[PDB]
Design a protein around this ligand. Structure first.
Ligand SMILES: CC(C)C[C@H](N)C(=O)NS(=O)(=O)OC[C@H]1OC[C@@H](CCCn2cc(CNCc3ccccc3)nn2)[C@H](O)[C@@H]1O
Ligand SMILES: [Mg+2]
Ligand SMILES: [Zn+2]
Length: 839
């Protein structure tokens, strides 16, 4: 055994030992309990970053833990290859996105193999290969003829300079981020997944996810946004019907989730595209400018509540069908045309948004809800104004005294009696638009024929291969400029036809890749029936919190779609979910700001550039990114200390949910502990060699060795509970360090002492194997000759936890240090089990 810990010597040999044994290459063996541990597969951006290393180390710790407990563990890896990154690097390097993608895949695959992740590389997938996306094109065609996928016109943001479509997140003050030109709003036909049909199922099945973070389930419920409200129709006053036609001349229909406060409505608001706004603005220039300003907006839901709400009166009036109050209609900028009826009512006394809106324009506030003896200040909002559970109605006529639910049915009864309204259920969830005007993506299997219409590609002709011999210039979608691609024949009549040049949303490939891992070479479907029946669903899922809404909701949606097609048998894809925190680092620059990467900086007084001696400016600590040039390359971390030191540093610096801060001193400490672990096993084997680990009746051991066995098996139970239940790996590392400290302070020189020392070391290297498997595999082969994965997870000897009982009999006046203070708690004693009290 080498005296000093050398990572570059043991890590390749340990990885070769694991590959030759094929411990990670698992199949559908029905003679062993399966476990599907999955980490979110990465974009082949070029090289790994610290966020990747943390995620896949967390997944490998859990996978190796289940592996040591006898599970048939599958930990697959893959590449989310489609997207704008490859298209942007194409425009900057004059290289095809496919060639740029495949080079990154082979390089990042080399890095992942260097870290020693126990993954099944025989199940590797790449979403940009036709062997993969042929099946999402297949599901598209099946759902297209079923109506789940449909095609209709949708409004997009067009940049007339960059010649591309931009999202609302890419529109600043109505202009593009790169071009800076005023964006144009055009209606173009696009494809949609009718996800609203599964809205109630996607909402209620969240309750099954008992091992999901409650904030993630809460984030999905709010995004779905189911509300059980009331449709209310306000009769248009006879003096306000000019310019209106049809039902819009009869009434103004709104939707509200608080019909118990209908008596408190002081005004109503419509959208800019509402016919009431159109008729009222026909002769008012100030309203036409307000309607044009609303239509030219681009407020995303990530900041639609931070939008400055504003409105303008119209002069038209409607009638409240429950008290006769003549209410004026306003044009508001928060009423969205397409949500409900494009019109709402406002109760400023019990809705915080209507409160601020009314206080802005000095609009009346009518209290109709009272919660106890709480005072009502009309010039100050209080949280009890919007209470529903503990409130009764006031100033509501014959509705006073009722709570929320009874007044809900009471208002519904009156509205349905006169035909002025009825209950209704709605959802904030919109349909999923999947059309993208880019090249580097999965083609949409639709052929356009002027005789047959929008026709899906037959199953025999799939896939519609995306040509990889393309270098996008940027003046539009390259597929739209390639007649060799889109010109084809119609699959129904055989005449001249054009292919769909748009590609699919890249979230589609990540919505089902967890099923493809079960049979990534199955040529007859998305997933074979025998594999999906065996592996079932994903037991453990690890990924960042940024995907807690869209990606997870899309995966649950696709799971139910595939289930209803007889492909899979599960209702949910992910049983357990672990969201990892971000990785932050300090930033440095040199003004002239010119941010410098920390790997080239040398420092507690100040810091300076490693290339010379020019002092740098230390700035704030932020998440690692290319914005402030504070990303620390993980490859340099491996080249300096080895893979085990990197894994150990990330699992010990912070719990997985908590954000990890980069620290050069912390990396040195992790490497220093690995030296200590190596030195400990070496010094033990030098003074005698390996022996048989202690086992059996511990009675007869010294008090010192009994305490070391107590600390040992309590540490095993602590680590086992930290891996299985809490999933808090930094505390498990601390527990093993505490065991080694007591080992250092224990005389293990005797024959029975060596046996306990062997039991301590054989357990410590196995408890730390899921975290640092390279050095643990090497140290285990020096202490024991058997296979580590065949020895299994260390068992807890509960006999070593039961402490010795101090039993004796007390005696006061004849009849019935350490033992005297306990007896006096309830005069010389006998050194044994007898204490006499001379009173
Ligand atoms: C399931 C599927 C939807 C996943 C998808 N392929 C994906 O997110 N892949 S991934 O490679 O980003 O991360 C893959 C994994 O790594 C750990 C974590 C990173 C958190 C910090 N971070 C770093 C970064 C910069 N990279 C982002 C980037 C890169 C290139 C272009 C644009 C954006 N962002 N957040 C993740 O949540 C994810 O668990
Ligand atoms: Mg259950
Ligand atoms: Zn045709």
């Amino acid at each position: 055994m080498q005296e000093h810990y050398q990572p570059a010597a043991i890590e390749p040999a340990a990885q070769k030992k694991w590959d030759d044994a094929r411990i990670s290459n698992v199949s559908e063996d029905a003679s062993k309990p399966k476990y599907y541990c999955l980490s979110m597969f990465p974009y082949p951006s070029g090289k790994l970053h610290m966020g990747h290393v943390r995620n896949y180390t967390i997944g490998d710790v859990l996978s190796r833990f289940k592996l040591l407990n006898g599970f048939n563990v599958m930990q697959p890896m893959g590449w989310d290859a489609f997207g704008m990154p490859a298209e942007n690097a194409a425009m900057k390097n004059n290289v095809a996105p496919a060639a740029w993608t495949y080079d990154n895949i082979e390089y990042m695959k080399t890095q992942l193999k260097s870290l020693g992740f126990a993954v099944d590389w025989e199940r590797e997938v790449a979403t940009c290969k036709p062997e993969y996306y042929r099946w999402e094109q297949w599901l598209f065609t099946k759902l297209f003829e079923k109506g789940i996928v449909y095609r209709k016109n949708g409004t997009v943001n067009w940049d007339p300079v960059d010649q591309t479509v931009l999202a609302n997140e890419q529109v600043i003050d109505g202009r593009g981020w790169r071009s800076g030109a005023l964006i144009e709003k055009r209606e173009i036909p696009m494809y949609y997944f009718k996800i609203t049909d599964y809205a109630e199922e996607l909402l209620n099945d969240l309750d099954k996810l008992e091992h999901w973070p409650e904030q993630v389930k809460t984030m999905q419920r709010n995004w779905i946004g189911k509300s059980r409200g009331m449709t209310v129709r306000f009769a248009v006053s006879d003096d306000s019907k000019q310019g209106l036609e049809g039902d819009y001349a009869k009434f103004l229909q709104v939707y509200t989730t608080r019909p118990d406060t209908l008596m408190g409505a002081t005004y109503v608001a419509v959208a800019a595209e509402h016919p009431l706004a159109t008729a009222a603005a026909a002769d008012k220039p100030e309203l036409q400018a307000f309607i044009a300003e609303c239509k030219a907006g681009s407020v995303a839901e990530a900041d639609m509540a931070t939008m400055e709400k504003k409105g303008v009166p119209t002069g038209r009036y409607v009638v409240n069908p429950l008290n006769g109050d003549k209410l004026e209609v306003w044009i508001a900028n928060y009423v969205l045309w397409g949500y409900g009826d494009g019109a709402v009512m406002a109760v400023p006394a019990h809705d915080e948004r209507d409160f601020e809106f009314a206080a802005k324009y000095n609009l009346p506030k009518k209290q109709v809800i009272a919660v106890g003896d709480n005072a009502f200040d009309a010039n100050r909002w209080q949280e009890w104004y919007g209470d529903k559970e503990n409130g009764v109605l006031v100033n509501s006529g014959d509705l006073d005294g009722l709570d929320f639910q009874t007044a809900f049915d009471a208002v519904a009864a009156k509205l349905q009696s006169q035909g002025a309204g009825e209950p209704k259920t709605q959802y904030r969830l919109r349909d999923w638009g999947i059309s993208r005007q880019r090249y580097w993506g999965c083609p949409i299997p639709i052929v356009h024929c002027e005789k047959c219409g929008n026709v899906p590609v037959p199953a025999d002709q799939l896939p519609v291969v995306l040509p990889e011999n393309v270098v996008p210039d940027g003046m539009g979608s390259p597929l739209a400029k390639m007649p060799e691609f889109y010109e084809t024949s119609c699959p129904c009549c055989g005449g001249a036809a054009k292919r769909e040049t748009d590609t699919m949303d890249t979230f589609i490939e990540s919505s089902w890749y967890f099923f493809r891992y079960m049979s990534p070479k199955f040529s007859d479907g998305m997933v074979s029936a025998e594999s999906a029946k065996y592996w079932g669903a994903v037991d453990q899922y690890i990924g960042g919190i940024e995907h807690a809404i869209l990606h997870l909701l899309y995966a649950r949606f696709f799971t139910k779609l595939m289930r209803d097609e007889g492909l899979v048998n599960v209702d949910e894809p992910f049983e357990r979910l672990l969201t990892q925190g971000m990785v932050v680092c300090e930033t440095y620059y040199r003004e002239n700001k010119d941010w410098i990467n920390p790997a080239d900086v040398e420092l507690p007084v100040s810091a300076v550039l490693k290339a010379d001696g020019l002092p740098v400016v230390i700035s704030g600590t932020e998440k690692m990114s290319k914005s402030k040039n504070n990303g620390v390359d993980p490859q340099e971390l491996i080249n300096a200390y080895g893979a085990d030191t990197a894994r150990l540093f990330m699992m010990f610096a912070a719990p997985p949910e908590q954000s990890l801060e980069w620290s050069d001193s912390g990396v040195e400490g992790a490497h220093r502990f690995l030296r200590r672990l190596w030195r400990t096993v070496y010094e033990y084997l030098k003074q005698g060699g390996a022996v048989k680990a202690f086992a059996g009746n511990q009675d007869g051991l010294s008090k010192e060795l009994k305490d070391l066995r107590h600390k040992l098996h309590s540490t095993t139970a602590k680590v086992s509970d930290d891996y299985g239940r809490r999933q808090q790996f930094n505390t498990a590392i601390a527990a093993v360090m505490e065991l080694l400290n007591q080992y250092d302070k224990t005389d293990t020189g005797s024959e029975q002492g060596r046996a306990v020392a062997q039991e301590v070391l054989e357990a410590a290297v196995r408890l730390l194997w899921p975290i640092v498997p390279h050095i643990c595999e090497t140290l285990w082969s020096e202490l024991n000759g058997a296979k580590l994965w065949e020895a299994g997870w260390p068992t807890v000897d509960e006999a070593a936890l039961v402490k010795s009982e101090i039993e004796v009999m007390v005696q006061v006046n004849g009849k019935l240090a350490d033992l005297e203070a306990a007896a006096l708690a309830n005069i010389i004693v006998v050194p044994g089990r007898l204490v006499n009290i001379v009173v």
